Amino acid sequence: RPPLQEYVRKLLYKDLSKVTTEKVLRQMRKLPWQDQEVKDYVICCMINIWNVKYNSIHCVANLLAGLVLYQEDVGIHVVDGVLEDIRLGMEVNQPKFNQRRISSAKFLGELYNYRMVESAVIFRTLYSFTSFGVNPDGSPSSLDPPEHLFRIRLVCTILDTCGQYFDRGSSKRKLDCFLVYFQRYVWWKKSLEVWTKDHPFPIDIDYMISDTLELLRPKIKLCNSLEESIRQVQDLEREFLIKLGLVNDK
Amino acid sequence: KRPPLQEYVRKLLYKDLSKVTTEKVLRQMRKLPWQDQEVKDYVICCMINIWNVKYNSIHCVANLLAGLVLYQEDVGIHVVDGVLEDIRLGMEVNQPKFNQRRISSAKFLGELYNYRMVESAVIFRTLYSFTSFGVNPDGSPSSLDPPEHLFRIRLVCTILDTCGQYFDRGSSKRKLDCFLVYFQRYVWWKKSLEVWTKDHPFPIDIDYMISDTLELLRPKIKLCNSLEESIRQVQDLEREFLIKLGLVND
Amino acid sequence: ALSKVVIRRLPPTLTKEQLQEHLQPMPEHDYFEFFSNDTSLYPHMYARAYINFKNQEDIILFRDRFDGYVFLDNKGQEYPAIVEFAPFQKAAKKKTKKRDTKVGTIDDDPEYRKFLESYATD
Amino acid sequence: ALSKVVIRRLPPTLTKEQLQEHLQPMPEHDYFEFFSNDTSLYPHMYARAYINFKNQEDIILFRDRFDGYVFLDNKGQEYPAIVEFAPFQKAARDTKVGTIDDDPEYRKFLESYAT
């Protein structure tokens, strides 16, 4: 590969781990951003964040947060490209892409941590995890087969990356509403007939859910049943109904 | 073979109400021993069994009760509670031999709104239950809603025939507008079932019943010509509900 | 805010007393009525009751404790009860006014007396 | 408000001039450009485009014409296209631009690279 193109793979996939982030930024303000081909090459490099090791993905979002003060469109295209890759990941849904898809979701969370996207982008992605290709009755579907529990890992990855900031204001209620729908989705999967005493629900998924929910809400009632999960959704949607004035007034 | 006071109450409601003025009937109804709980319960039960009244004189019963509540205020609340209970039980029983009785009570409930015994909340609460109780959010047939069972369409149209003309101004105008969106999807759910072929076509009298009722209430309404068109209407409307509720933005 | 609660699909032979016996401890309420055998869909008979709560944090406990509670009839049949908000939220409000001066006067009414003879020659 | 729209799952060899060849007459728009071969999930390669409309009514008729619109690739395979509201609604000087050509640390890098 050309010299300049592997110069970036050093800057983004190697150096960012053990170097000042503020030094590599001016070294990429260096690049010929007028040239559309090399500007395209590194938008592609940040979209392929699966190359970066997990605990430095936030450093890539830290770098990109600084550049958009000089080439703002590069952040627009990376954000649009990551959101497209998350959607395509659910459409492909091959287990060989798990590490890449987890990194992409983690990246989107860090991009919110550095104010590249607002909470609406995160919550759109979160709801798409629990509903895109999902049957509205919880029945297994084409894109969400019974043993496929990857949506839960995708939800937990984003909530563990950026969910702690949804502690106040509107984002606190937006998270509270989504957690009601997330608990019903979790219990839709737990109630499928595939899970028996011989084929039990994976205990490590149970811990991952409780960690993510105990980290965000120390005083949350984990529904220990599907009917407990369903009634809370009914209660929440009843308040949605009242404020919408669909049977009542005002 | 019936107690004479019981036959007299049936005479006032099931015979005299169509032939004589309702105020003359109200004069006699006030003289009953309303302080006796058995007699008060028999009059209430007589009015819940509205199917004994000719269809064209059901509105005279609501007009009678609306004057009766000036002297026996609680009687109108018990009659409404019983009629709404019978409508819910009718969908749980759903035996075709009770078709005329379930049509009567739906017509009665609409007339009870026309004489201001209930407000629009009760009507729309009942209208939405016709399209949701025992109905899969999938749209697939249910045990309470089997494929050739089109009684929900006739229950909805019966109420819209009786009281829908008044939902043309103010907040009740938007409530009907939203409901007709959900009603057109429910209609195209039934039309989309595999059971309907050239050998077993969708009943054309139901089609005319739908458009007749919808053209009575909204002259410029768009009747959906496909299931995809009806789904797009619901999605666009629910996008508005999402914008107003701030579950993703705000 | 919604305060009227209905408990339905109770056994058709149950009484108001047997129901409150199963309901204690009952929270505070304005309204507690009991109906049965008044349906038009014979022989599908059931009993029901309405309760209007003073504070609305009790309904969620009442629903969580009795929605599904199995009652028994006269012949040992099971009757899992349903607890929901009443579709008509209006409830009776005390004895507002005095009695109508005409109630209980049908026993000496002339129009009702002529009917009694026609009911002797049915 | 909601004004940015994405048309995705297009054939990976489709170009922008060919795409608007199918889209014409294009409604009133501010932004419209085209990306391809930028995914992490090779070989599942598609193309897409984003449009920002100037009027709310132009969109309800745009998706009615092109959501489901089947495109074709080089060897006949079909590509039904999807039209939704884009997930990121935000749409798209410096003096140090293009100065790593003739830049010291770049020059040190390239001799580390020759070996």
List keywords for this structure.
heterotetramer, A: 250 residues, mainly alpha, 0% strand, C: 122 residues, alpha+beta, Alpha-Beta Plaits, two-stranded antiparallel ribbon, 3 helices, Regulator of nonsense transcripts 3B (chain C), Regulator of nonsense transcripts 2 (chain B), rna binding protein
Contiguous helical run count of chain C: 3
Q: What share of residues of chain C is helical? A: 10-25%
Which word captures the global form of chain A?
globular
Q: What is the number of strand segments of chain C?
A: 6
Question: How many structural domains are formed by the residues of chain A?
Answer: 1
| % residues in beta strands of chain A | under 5%
CATH topology name of chain C, in short, is: Alpha-Beta Plaits
Structural class label of chain C: alpha+beta
* Multimeric status of the protein: heterotetramer
- Name the CATH superfamily classification of chain C: RRM (RNA recognition motif) domain
Number of DSSP helical runs of chain A: 11
Q: Which range best describes the helical content of chain A: under 10%, 10-25%, 25-40%, 40-55%, 55-70% or over 70%? A: 55-70%
- Output the CATH class name of chain C: Alpha Beta
Estimated radius of gyration of chain C? 19 Å
Report the sheet with the most strands of chain A, covering strand number, pairing sense and barrel closure: none
| Physical arrangement of strands within the biggest beta sheet of chain C | 2-3-1-6
**Largest interface, with Cβ-Cβ < 8 Å?**
B-C, 44 and 35 residues
Protein name (chain C): Regulator of nonsense transcripts 3B
Subcellular location (chain C): Nucleus; Cytoplasm
Family (chain C): Belongs to the RENT3 family.
Modified residues (Phosphothreonine) (chain C): 121
